[PDB]
Design an enzyme around this catalytic site. Structure first.
Site, mmCIF file in Angstrom:
data_model
loop_
_atom_site.group_PDB
_atom_site.id
_atom_site.type_symbol
_atom_site.label_atom_id
_atom_site.label_comp_id
_atom_site.label_asym_id
_atom_site.label_seq_id
_atom_site.Cartn_x
_atom_site.Cartn_y
_atom_site.Cartn_z
ATOM 1 N N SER A 1 0.857 -1.179 0.000
ATOM 2 C CA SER A 1 0.000 0.000 0.000
ATOM 3 C C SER A 1 0.892 1.227 0.000
ATOM 4 O O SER A 1 1.473 1.574 1.033
ATOM 5 N N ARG A 2 0.997 1.887 -1.150
ATOM 6 C CA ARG A 2 1.925 2.998 -1.278
ATOM 7 C C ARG A 2 1.547 4.186 -0.405
ATOM 8 O O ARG A 2 2.384 5.072 -0.202
ATOM 9 N N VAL A 3 0.316 4.238 0.102
ATOM 10 C CA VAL A 3 -0.006 5.211 1.139
ATOM 11 C C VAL A 3 0.602 4.788 2.469
ATOM 12 O O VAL A 3 1.115 5.628 3.216
#
Ligand SMILES: Nc1ncnc2c1ncn2[C@@H]1O[C@H](COP(=O)(O)OP(=O)(O)OP(=O)(O)O)[C@@H](O)[C@H]1O
Ligand SMILES: Nc1ncnc2c1ncn2[C@@H]1O[C@H](COP(=O)(O)OP(=O)(O)OP(=O)(O)O)[C@@H](O)[C@H]1O
Ligand SMILES: [Mg+2]
Ligand SMILES: [Mg+2]
Lengths: 50, 464, 393, 333, 464, 38
Positions: free
Chosen positions: C369-371
């Site tokens: 999850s790049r967040v």
């Protein structure tokens, strides 16, 4: 949860019967106006009193 | 004299002109969409002359709402973008219109985004290392100051994270001018980059150009050129040292593919446009740095289907001095930032530039990693216990080296929680030299994971 | 019960009017398989809605010198040569409003659940531009899916685009329906800043499966705040291509009014197939894997409209949980990688892990999850900062 | 709570069912009422007049072919301005003959329609082939047509056929039959619109055109009431259809005939033959709306339920009472 | 009036009509072939409108002998099939013409083979389990009564034999009616099924519609719709519970592909029709069971070249409540019904539907088999000897489980002469719980082949 | 009869300088009408 579902089913069936009867009643009221409503719609499409 | 839209097919519009006023190629034409919800001035870029005074153009904005027979006026010049010291600290789109302050650059000097590359007589190879602070990059993929750098990656392997980290490491203390070109990347990452640069006061030295993936193929084709035109103005007209980040350059070629078939071109292998190499070569050769005028360019190159044999990555590889190749196999093993130490390369990783110690250490690391990669097949079935004693020691060292090449990056803080770290080049060389000679074979391998330096190695070894 | 039974008819009759106006009408010259060519219509806009006589709608995709190549959006069996085609005068658009909550609708917005018509507040064009870089703000508000693996290793934030990708029967729809169901506690708060509205876009799913999802949402109370844009497999390729955009428009209407939306697209792989069918029937030469060159654009144009708007625009958000079906566990295929590169993360559900007893079956290494921590509460961030990398190792 | 919502949904379902039934009954009754009302001739005329009152307050050639055809028609005007009825007939016949030649000799047309700039070789070929067979004016027209470049080989045949039609149109104009030819061409247009099978038989260009023209003479143009100029036009068109349908070809020819005089044809559908007063009112109002003199072609369609509808080009003004009835029926909530 | 044949391209015929008589889509048209032995009235189905009053049509009988310009008369209605109780016990082709008694059914009610799928409001999910008596099906892929069941498999793996087994287990004692739709399987198998059903006295309750391989593509793509119209009439007009056996719905997709190639539509990924998903949805959303009226459907699906990633199997997977993927690997081992326990699945294998114990046993079996599959390469190279003791025990009981999933099907008596068994669900659950707990891991592997039960297992153990 | 002979004569008719004209141009390719002796 089973008791709640059973009582919900019971009230659902009772409401279904009551609403069906009441709709059968309101059917006569709707039919009482159907004719005037149709005349008004015909006049509206023709642009003049039917 | 004005044109007339005859045929509209997605992002490609055919326009008929009077016989005496056919616009030249790459000219900008303005049509008008009058439907209220989508009303706009539609910029078409002439892409072909197809006879009978019909031109074929690639629309920059979506063509939804365009009507056959609507008048199309000819600008007489190609798409032009503002240039100068003014465009620094501001966000533009492909067409050069400002985003964060509409109507800002309307009166700056405007340059056409189409120009020939610098003459071969002006090219001078660059051989000066650019110290990043990342262990893997500094050791095995040493970047070049004034050269061209690439982050090759499959889908979602951390190209954007690593390029943001690279901005954090190179641009913060850079005395020159930065230009970031969002060529069909994710808009959320662009906004994060914008806010991060504003917070660090690097925005005032950086001009951002965004052609994000919501835009149609025309903008995704011409945004790279629009940003590169500002980069070229800074290189030529001011002699400033320039940084040119691009993410993702593949979206350029991909965009050309989307309109390739609508333009009437027969598709080449893997469905790409026949002019893949020529278009990419023009764009990439515009990014080079002439003698006495430096553009340190860094391009994120998307590798479709995680296939490095795909035509686009393969053609792009020839245009680069250093190529950090990110692989999903490494990313799956937790080794952030995903670099394949064996595929990545650099033209300055020679003993005559980086030095004998650096070259020896890097090449011994590559030797160990290649041997470990060959052994993985044996270990997965026959077991490590049946390997040679030398091979077993090499496997242990290789695991430690693979985990030590991982680093807690500044941009990855929100992936690991821990803050970023910087490893000086001398420290990287010393640490990997020791690893290769086996001076850390007594520490557990997990002690080498996401530490960034020898002091952090010792601290995490104590913690374990 | 009320006088509305006759009152509504009276109001309709009194207010009804069919004032004549110039219609600018063309004629069909070729029809079949959901594609119709219309001669005439000089002033038709690209992606305009065309009305065919049977009440059927089409979208004018191709606009050539001779004819207009439109994709019939609905039952195309009633389209025949010589048939009379009116232009709607409005670009491809769908009704939107709060009235779509708890309703199952076609990609055109008209209901298919058998209940009454939907009182749409207005109409939104399906192809409005996505929020720009200066109109967004960082994803910082978590969207609790209720699944430990996702909320710990691959957290999904409001404004994020998390891809649920995996083979057949690996738990994808289960994850998305659980995420929708977990928002009931927020919906009952009555606070728009906490309420998360949902739009489950069903594409190429058999009707009984959408009915099963609807029953799962009803039994969990999620249909009080969930809309279903159902394009069942029976519906032509036009609906299967248009459903994600209709869901995105319904969600965007709430997004731009300061409300938080969650969009599930189930599956975007079936949208790609429908778009391939539409493009081949229109005779666009295809690209790789027989898909159109625009197949990437198709998804980006859609997924990039899921964003976290800035405070100046109301602060709304739209979270996308696109679902991709991989073939033979190959995450390295064309459409899978396209969507992976368009989205902010993955939840790669693997059949191998699912069989091994790992449910929800997240491959920890591939998933990301790049967040990241920004989409987690500080307690969860502290407790699980390195959990995903630790599990990968 | 879920059960309460379920019973509420049941109540709303019953309300909607009652509304649907009432609305359907009301609309059916209104349809019966309007059908009865429209039956009166005076009432139908009143509806038509009301619709006119409502009104009272309201190509296939690319650039090269377009310019070349414009130049050809300009030179045709220049040359035939001083022609005569017999001369115009000869011009039309010879233009039709050379069109037939080009259609049959595909290679000859392909070489003749070469877009190259050097016109002299093409003119020399045209001479060598056809100089001794035709008159000077038609030969000059054909030489100019071949001299100009055409976007496609078929465009040369299209242009020579167009000039052939214009020859007969000028013949009619000189004789003063401009209105009669237009109306009587429209008469065949409607005749061929009916009996659609015949339209296909004429459309057959694979069989020799002699059989097609013989069929036309036996069926339509052999009668004494047919205007000679229009009969010649029909024969010329059927002899050169080249895939264009006979009915569409004839109606397009009538459209060309009206266009050559500056007017535009409007197709009007009514439940019964409109009277002269409303006919002239319709013509005047349509001219006012379209900014161009119009010629109205009436069609009797009782299915419209006593309204009036107009179609001009690609635009349609639908005032039919049947259309309003359908809108009301489908407009039910 | 009538039309004329203008083009003929295999089983596809273009017919030109007058302006006002162009038939609607899916109408039935009648042409004539008058040449000797090929003479026949030829049924065409309108598939496209081509303009200029031409309609392109699919021939239901082979066009061999058709002449350009021959008169074509449109019937004004789509292809219609007989429906009623009189339809049972008889054999029909795609056009509704009876084969057992050629003149039969002409006086019955006729229903168009084309109709809209049931309204979404009429659909509800079915979750009742259909106990078959097969261990693998009852354990790992519970069939749904009123739901959609599929049997995938390459060539020669046992699709038709399992279809016959399920006819023997479900249709044999079924209270309602049955419909068997051949959609391109052997005429030999059709005759065998007809005689078997007559012998078993199930024929009187079942209607057979065949349209087998030798038929042209139009017949092979409308026979499914004809049989489905019969089943729909039984579902809706008679209120009966309906079984609907299809062998093979792949042959419907393949016929569609052939027609699409002939209709001039551009090919999809692997040559299939671009409308593959649309056609399959139109066919298979009709097979669903509406609220108060159930239609159980069991379909064989041919996977070409044993490729489960082929577009046709992949498209049909989304339509099925339960799938039984027969595998070449299992078949080569002699484990009939050759079900691949890991790829096969059912929607009702949910503890809320089948119970905690059944679900737990099924998931433990799947865990053991998946772990066995993971160890497959190591077993291939080095064998069980190098495995860890836990994995060794797991592999032993995994082999025993896999072989115990095999059963002596009652339809297999024609091949091996062994009578068939039926294992009640409770006994299957208990036996597999004991297997997973190792209570039988001392018996030889051979005791579990084709035994079908616990008492039979003990008997065969005594035999060995 | 004379059609073939006249066509052949015209074809043969097609020291003066030869100059063509570009009719199409796109993607590095240009189509040039004329230049019969190229
Ligand atoms: N976390 C879980 N725990 C237990 N069972 C689960 C879980 N997730 C899914 N399942 C079950 O596993 C199967 C997967 O079904 P699901 O609808 O989630 O899959 P899908 O990805 O949507 O598949 P499809 O391709 O068939 O649409 C179903 O039996 C579902 O009930
Ligand atoms: N349960 C079984 N017991 C014994 N033999 C079997 C069994 N199932 C299949 N076979 C063997 O496999 C042969 C093929 O079976 P079947 O006719 O069902 O094939 P299929 O999978 O339908 O293949 P096809 O694609 O040719 O239709 C059978 O004749 C028999 O030889
Ligand atoms: Mg699903
Ligand atoms: Mg078989």
């Amino acid at each position: 949860r089973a008791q709640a579902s059973g009582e919900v089913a019971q009230t659902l069936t009772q409401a279904d019967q009551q609403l069906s009867a009441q709709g059968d009643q309101v059917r006569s009221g709707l039919e009482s106006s159907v004719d005037g409503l149709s005349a008004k719609l015909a006049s509206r499409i023709l642009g003049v009193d039917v | 004299t004005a044109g007339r839209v005859v045929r509209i097919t997605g992002p490609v519009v055919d326009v008929e002109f009077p016989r005496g006023s056919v616009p030249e190629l790459f000219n900008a034409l303005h049509a008008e969409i009058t439907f209220g919800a989508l009303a706009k001035t539609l910029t078409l870029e002439v892409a072909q002359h197809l006879g009978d005074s019909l031109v074929r153009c690639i629309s920059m904005q979506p063509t939804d709402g365009l009507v056959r027979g609507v008048e199309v006026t000819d600008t007489g010049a190609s798409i032009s973008v503002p240039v100068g010291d003014g465009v620094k600290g501001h966000v533009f789109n492909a067409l050069g219109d400002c985003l964060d302050d509409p109507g800002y650059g309307k009166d700056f000097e405007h340059w056409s985004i189409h120009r020939k590359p610098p003459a071969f007589s002006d090219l001078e190879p660059r051989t000066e290392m650019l110290e990043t602070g990342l262990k893997v990059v500094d050791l095995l993929t040493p970047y070049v100051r004034g050269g061209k750098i690439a982050l090759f990656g499959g889908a979602g392997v951390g190209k954007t994270v690593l390029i943001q980290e690279m901005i954090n490491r190179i641009a913060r203390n850079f005395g020159g001018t930065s230009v970031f070109a969002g060529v069909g990347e994710r808009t959320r990452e662009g906004n994060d980059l914008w806010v991060e640069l504003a917070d660090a006061n690097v925005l005032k030295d950086t001009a951002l150009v965004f052609g994000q993936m919501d835009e149609p193929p025309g903008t995704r084709m011409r945004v790279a050129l629009s940003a590169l035109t500002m980069a070229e103005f800074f290189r030529d007209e001011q002699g400033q040292d320039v940084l040119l980040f691009i993410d993702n350059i593949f979206r350029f070629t991909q965009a050309g593919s989307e309109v390739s078939t609508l333009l009437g071109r027969m598709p080449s292998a893997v469905g790409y446009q026949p002019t893949l190499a020529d278009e990419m070569g023009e764009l990439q050769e515009r990014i080079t740095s002439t003698r006495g005028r430096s553009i340190t360019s860094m391009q994120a190159v998307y590798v479709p289907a995680d296939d490095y044999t795909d035509p686009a990555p393969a053609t792009t590889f020839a245009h680069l001095d250093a190529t950090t190749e990110l692989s999903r196999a490494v990313f799956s093993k937790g080794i952030f930032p995903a670099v394949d130490p064996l595929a990545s390369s650099s033209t300055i990783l020679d003993p005559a530039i980086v030095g004998d110690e650096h070259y020896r250490v890097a090449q011994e690391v590559i030797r160990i990693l290649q041997r470990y990669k060959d052994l993985q097949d044996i270990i997965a079935i026959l077991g490590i216990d049946e390997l040679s004693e030398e091979d077993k020691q090499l496997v242990n060292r290789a695991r430690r080296i693979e985990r030590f090449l991982s680093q807690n990056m500044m941009a990855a803080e929100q992936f690991t929680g821990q803050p970023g770290s910087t490893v000086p080049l001398k420290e990287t060389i010393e640490a990997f030299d020791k690893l290769t000679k086996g001076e850390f074979d007594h520490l557990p391998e997990q002690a080498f994971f996401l530490i960034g330096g020898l002091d952090d190695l010792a601290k995490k070894a104590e913690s374990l | 019960s009320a006088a509305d039974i006759e009152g509504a008819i009276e109001d309709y009759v009194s207010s009804f009017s069919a004032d004549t106006e110039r219609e600018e009408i063309g004629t069909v010259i070729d029809a079949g398989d959901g594609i119709a060519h219309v001669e005439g219509l000089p002033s038709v806009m690209t992606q305009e809605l065309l009305e065919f006589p049977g009440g059927v709608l089409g979208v004018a995709l191709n606009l050539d010198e001779h004819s207009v190549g439109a994709v019939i959006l609905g039952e195309f069996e009633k389209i025949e040569e010589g048939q009379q085609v009116k232009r709607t005068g409005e670009v491809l658009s769908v009704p939107v409003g709060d009235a779509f909550l708890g309703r199952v609708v076609n990609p055109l917005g008209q209901p298919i659940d058998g209940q009454g018509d939907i009182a749409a507040e207005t109409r939104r064009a399906l192809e409005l531009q996505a929020p720009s870089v200066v109109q967004r703000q960082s994803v910082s508000e978590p969207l609790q899916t209720g699944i430990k693996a996702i909320d710990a290793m691959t957290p999904i934030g409001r404004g994020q685009r998390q891809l649920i990708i995996g083979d057949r029967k690996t738990g994808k729809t289960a994850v998305c329906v659980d995420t929708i169901l977990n928002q009931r506690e927020a919906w009952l708060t009555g606070d728009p800043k906490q309420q998360v509205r949902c739009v489950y876009v069903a594409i190429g799913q058999k009707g009984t499966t959408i009915a099963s999802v609807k029953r799962a949402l009803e039994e969990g109370g999620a249909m009080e705040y969930t809309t279903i844009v159902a394009a069942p497999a029976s519906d032509a390729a036009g609906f299967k291509w248009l459903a994600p955009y209709t869901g995105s428009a319904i969600g965007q209407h709430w997004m731009y009014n300061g409300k938080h939306v969650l969009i599930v697209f189930d599956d975007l792989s079936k949208q790609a197939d429908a778009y391939r069918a539409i493009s081949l029937l229109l005779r666009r030469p295809p690209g790789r894997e027989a898909f159109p060159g625009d197949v990437f654009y198709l998804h980006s144009r859609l997924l990039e409209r899921c964003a976290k708007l800035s405070d100046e625009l109301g602060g709304g958000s739209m979270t996308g949980l696109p679902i991709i079906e991989t073939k033979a566990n190959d995450i390295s295929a064309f459409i899978p990688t396209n969507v992976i590169s368009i989205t902010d993360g993955q939840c790669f559900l693997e059949s191998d892990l699912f069989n091994q007893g790992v449910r929800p079956a997240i491959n920890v290494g591939v998933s990301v999850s790049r967040v990241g921590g920004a989409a987690q509460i500080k307690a969860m961030k502290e407790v699980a900062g390195s959990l995903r990398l630790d599990l990968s190792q | 709570a879920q059960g309460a919502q379920q019973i509420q949904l049941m109540r709303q379902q019953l309300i909607r069912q009652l509304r649907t039934g009432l609305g359907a009954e009301a609309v059916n009754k209104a349809a019966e009422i309007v059908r009865a009302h429209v039956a009166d001739p005076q009432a139908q005329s009143a509806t038509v007049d009301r619709f006119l009152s409502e009104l009272e307050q309201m190509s296939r050639l690319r650039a090269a072919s377009r310019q070349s055809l414009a130049a050809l028609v300009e030179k045709f005007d220049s040359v035939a301005g001083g022609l005569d009825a017999d001369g115009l007939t000869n011009l039309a016949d010879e233009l039709a003959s050379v069109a037939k030649l080009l259609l049959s000799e595909t290679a000859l047309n392909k070489h003749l329609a070469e877009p190259t700039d050097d016109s002299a070789p093409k003119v020399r070929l045209l001479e060598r082939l056809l100089s001794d067979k035709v008159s000077a004016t038609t030969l000059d027209l054909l030489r100019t047509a071949v001299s100009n470049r055409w976007s496609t080989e078929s465009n040369l045949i299209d242009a020579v056929e167009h000039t052939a039609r214009l020859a007969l149109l000028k013949r009619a104009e000189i004789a003063g039959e401009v209105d009669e030819v237009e109306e009587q061409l429209f008469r065949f247009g409607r005749v061929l619109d009916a009996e659609p099978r015949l339209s296909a038989l004429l459309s057959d260009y694979t069989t020799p055109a002699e059989g097609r023209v013989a069929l036309l003479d036996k069926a339509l143009t052999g009668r004494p009431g047919v205007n000679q100029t229009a009969a010649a036009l029909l024969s010329q068109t059927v002899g050169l259809l080249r895939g264009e349908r006979a009915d569409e070809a004839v109606i397009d020819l009538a459209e060309l005939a009206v266009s050559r005089r500056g007017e535009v044809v409007a197709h009007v559908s009514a439940a019964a033959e409109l009277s002269d007063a409303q006919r002239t009112r319709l013509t005047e109002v349509l001219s006012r709306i379209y900014g161009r003199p119009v010629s109205v072609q009436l069609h009797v369609d009782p299915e419209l339920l006593g309204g009036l509808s107009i179609t001009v080009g690609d635009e349609v003004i639908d005032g039919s009472i049947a259309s309003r009835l359908a809108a009301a029926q489908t407009g039910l909530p």
